[PDB]
Amino acid sequence: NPESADLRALAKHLYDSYIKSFPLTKAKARAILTKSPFVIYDMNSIRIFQGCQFRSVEAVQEITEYAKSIPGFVNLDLNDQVTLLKYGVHEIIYTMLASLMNKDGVLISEGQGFMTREFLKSLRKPFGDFMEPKFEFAVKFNALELDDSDLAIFIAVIILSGDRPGLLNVKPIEDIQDNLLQALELQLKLNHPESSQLFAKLLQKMTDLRQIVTEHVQLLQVIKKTETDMSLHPLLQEIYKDLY
Amino acid sequence: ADLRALAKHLYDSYIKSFPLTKAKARAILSPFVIYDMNSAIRIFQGCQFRSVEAVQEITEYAKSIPGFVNLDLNDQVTLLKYGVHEIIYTMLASLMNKDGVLISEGQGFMTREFLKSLRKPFGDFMEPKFEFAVKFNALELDDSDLAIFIAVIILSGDRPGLLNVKPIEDIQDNLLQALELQLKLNHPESSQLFAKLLQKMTDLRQIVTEHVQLLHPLLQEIYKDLY
Ligand SMILES: COc1ccc2c(-c3c(C)n(Cc4cc(O[C@H](C)C(=O)O)ccc4Cl)c4cc(OC(F)(F)F)ccc34)noc2c1
Numbered sequence: 001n002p003e004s005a006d007l008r009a010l011a012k013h014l015y016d017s018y019i020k021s022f023p024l025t026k027a028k029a030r031a032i033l034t035k036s037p038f039v040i041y042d043m044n045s046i047r048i049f050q051g052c053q054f055r056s057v058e059a060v061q062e063i064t065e066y067a068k069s070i071p072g073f074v075n076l077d078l079n080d081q082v083t084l085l086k087y088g089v090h091e092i093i094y095t096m097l098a099s100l101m102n103k104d105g106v107l108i109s110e111g112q113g114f115m116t117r118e119f120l121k122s123l124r125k126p127f128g129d130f131m132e133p134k135f136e137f138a139v140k141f142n143a144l145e146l147d148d149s150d151l152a153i154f155i156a157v158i159i160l161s162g163d164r165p166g167l168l169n170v171k172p173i174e175d176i177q178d179n180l181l182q183a184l185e186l187q188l189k190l191n192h193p194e195s196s197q198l199f200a201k202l203l204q205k206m207t208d209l210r211q212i213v214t215e216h217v218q219l220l221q222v223i224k225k226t227e228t229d230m231s232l233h234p235l236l237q238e239i240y241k242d243l244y
Numbered sequence: 245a246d247l248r249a250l251a252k253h254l255y256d257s258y259i260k261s262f263p264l265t266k267a268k269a270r271a272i273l274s275p276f277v278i279y280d281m282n283s284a285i286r287i288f289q290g291c292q293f294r295s296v297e298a299v300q301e302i303t304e305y306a307k308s309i310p311g312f313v314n315l316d317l318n319d320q321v322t323l324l325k326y327g328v329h330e331i332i333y334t335m336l337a338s339l340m341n342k343d344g345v346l347i348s349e350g351q352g353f354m355t356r357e358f359l360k361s362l363r364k365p366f367g368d369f370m371e372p373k374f375e376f377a378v379k380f381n382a383l384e385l386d387d388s389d390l391a392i393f394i395a396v397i398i399l400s401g402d403r404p405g406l407l408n409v410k411p412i413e414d415i416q417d418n419l420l421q422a423l424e425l426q427l428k429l430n431h432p433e434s435s436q437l438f439a440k441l442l443q444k445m446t447d448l449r450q451i452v453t454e455h456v457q458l459l460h461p462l463l464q465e466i467y468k469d470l471y
């Protein structure tokens with residue numbers, strides 16, 4: 001079908017841009033998780049929290065590079081470009097994060113290490129429940145068995161939302177997302193012919209994404225007030241400033 | 245097919261469970277208009293009483309969903325527990341516009357501005373549901389589309405504490421196909437309506453979590469727990 005075909009080209013472009021933007025893919029991660037990592041499972045080896053903040057900022061930079069390649073995005077009103085990244089970039093971080101996680105832990109340091117879930121639950125202060133909600137999401141989301149060619153359209157869909165608070169020209173945004181959603185649907189149908197209504201089920205997962213970020217926001221307010229000693233990068237700080 | 249039967253059954257059960265349908269609401273949107281004090285803990289508490297009403301109507305509707313009464317009883321309980329609130333806001337949208345909501349089974353209409361003017365705690369009580377209703381109402385769904393949507397919501401295998409997820413997702417699968425087909429047939433030129441509707445569930449839950457945040461002995465007993 002002539003319409004399908006355009007969607008197929010779009011998928012390929014997105015997938016290719018994803019590969020260029022994100023050095024550590026789900027495929028490399030799974031290969032590593034199943035070359036092999038040094039494992040950290042207890043103290044014998046705030047610093048960790050600052051590491052996750054460091055990686056986040058880097059991920060924000062990587063996701064911003066990717067977004068620029070989504071057809072139409074850079075042509076949007078520059079203020080709406082800022083708004084979509086502000087409300088979308090963390091939802092994308094937790095998505096990509098699941099790629100690095102299994103039930104028991106998460107890859108760190110470009111894949112060269114693996115820090116266990118339990119170690120992270122045992123941390124002091126208001127830090128023990130810092131990563132947990134992500135592991136809980138990752139486990140449900142990883143069950144969908146998406147791969148990078150699927151994820152690549154999905155995260156695009158997440159960026160191009162016409163319901164983000166305070167958008168000026170919603171119309172141009174909903175036209176692009178309309179496209180990304182058809183592309184994803186086709187992609188999921190072709191790539192997972194036997195998985196029933198996977199499209200429906202992935203989109204429902206978008207719900208837990210939003211719960212993670214708003215819950216992470218609270219947790220940040222807690223941690224910053226208990227530890228007046230703790231830096232928050234201006235980049236993340238600005239993303240959370242308005243928000244919800 | 246099974247899927248049009250499923251869709252007709254759900255619509256039929258929806259008409260019978262819910263007195264004031266979107267179709268009836270939209271016709272109106274004449275009601276007594278409450279635009280100011282001349283026309284409150286009483287309003288907030290009244291809303292909580294209406295919520296208990298709606299839970300009952302929604303629960304009765306759930307029993308008509310093919311397969312639902314067959315699930316483990318504890319699991320029907322936890323599905324309704326986490327489902328009814330998301331369904332209340334979905335149904336409340338039917339009764340709202342940008343300027344106010346229909347109250348009193350359609351005979352009253354209270355303005356969005358009067359509600360926003362209530363003393364500090366209660367002034368933002370409703371405003372998040374108005375903001376959602378405006379977005380959701382742009383999809384222009386009607387009752388037959390909504391009948392299936394809310395069944396979908398009820399059949400969510402991700403609710404915490406479910407004993408047996410498999411049959412629940414099996415059923416939501418049927419409903420989702422049924423929903424998807426309903427929206428292709430009813431809304432031909434609404435390109436990705438199915439997907440856009442499912443995305444709205446993201447705002448739905450966020451309303452619920454935010455509302456939990458903001459939140460006579462025999463009366464206290466009736467209208468406790470299930471909010
Ligand atoms: C763009 O997509 C992406 C999303 C997430 C991530 C990542 C990435 C990884 C591997 N972790 C786990 C992690 C990283 C650590 O960092 C140090 C530096 C180390 O790794 O040695 C230490 C301990 C733990 Cl548990 C986190 C945590 C995080 O914070 C939060 F959002 F709050 F969840 C954001 C990003 C990452 N990396 O690359 C991406 C890309």
Ligand SMILES: COc1ccc2c(-c3c(C)n(Cc4cc(O[C@H](C)C(=O)O)ccc4Cl)c4cc(OC(F)(F)F)ccc34)noc2c1
Nearest residue numbers: 290291292294295298301302332335336339345346347348
């Ligand atoms: C089952 O589907 C349904 C969902 C919601 C509703 C309703 C319904 C209506 C019309 N309102 C608005 C309303 C009702 C009031 O109460 C009085 C008694 C009145 O209703 O006149 C006063 C002021 C306002 Cl803004 C609310 C508020 C509510 O609480 C909460 F969820 F917390 F928001 C729950 C239900 C309703 N009615 O019927 C249904 C059915």
